[PDB]
Amino acid sequence: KSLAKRIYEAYLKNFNMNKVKARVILSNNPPFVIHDMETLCMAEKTLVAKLVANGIQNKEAEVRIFHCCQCTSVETVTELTEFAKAIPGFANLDLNDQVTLLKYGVYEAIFAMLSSVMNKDGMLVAYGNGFITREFLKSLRKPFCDIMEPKFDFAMKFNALELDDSDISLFVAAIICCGDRPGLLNVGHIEKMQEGIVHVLRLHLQSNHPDDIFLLPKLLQKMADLRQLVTEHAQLVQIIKKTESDAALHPLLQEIYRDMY
């Protein structure tokens, strides 16, 4: 019972974006939406964007989006390591265990986590300051279009559940710590951790969503689906670095990506 709240509390501090806020905003002005290249350039120009993007100058709309995407990943991955630390008994794990879980984990956790800002119409950007059309993301020249859509497809089915922030935190913690990941020093401590974290979900679902008694099976399924998406994501990212002269990968992202697929 203590474990569950501790994850919720840890999750709340670490992540700027939570489900309530994304849903709520969607309040003097609505988040500026980008449905077009023209709109993107103007959105790109504005003071907030300039402040928070690292001042990217690439000259390719598709290239800038892919680089702009990266700020979110680095930002999320950094937050994920902190979340992992908060989880009881994660601190214990050996550096090979902690790092290995994170490298596989960070992208799986994000995709489930990404959903809350996501909408069938669009996804929130710049801490909710901006909205980008799903159509517009899909329009971008290959292979840049491919990355956003399946994540959205997963997002549509995943959103439907539907999970409070407490639910996610438990889900996320489970994703982060997996016995299966390659090269783990100890299988038993992670597996023991998973059981604890996963058990909490079971107790949690019964009080929280009495209306759905089957949530855990469906929720568990998502991890298998998520695993494929990271594989699919990884393969795509690899394409860009080889195919495109222009695209650039953050040092942290390279370490995570390398050896993952």
Partner: peptide, 11 residues
């Protein structure tokens, strides 16, 4: 092999 990640945890 994972400089950034080791640094992140240790700080």
């Amino acid at each position: 092999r994972h400089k950034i990640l080791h640094r992140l945890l240790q700080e």
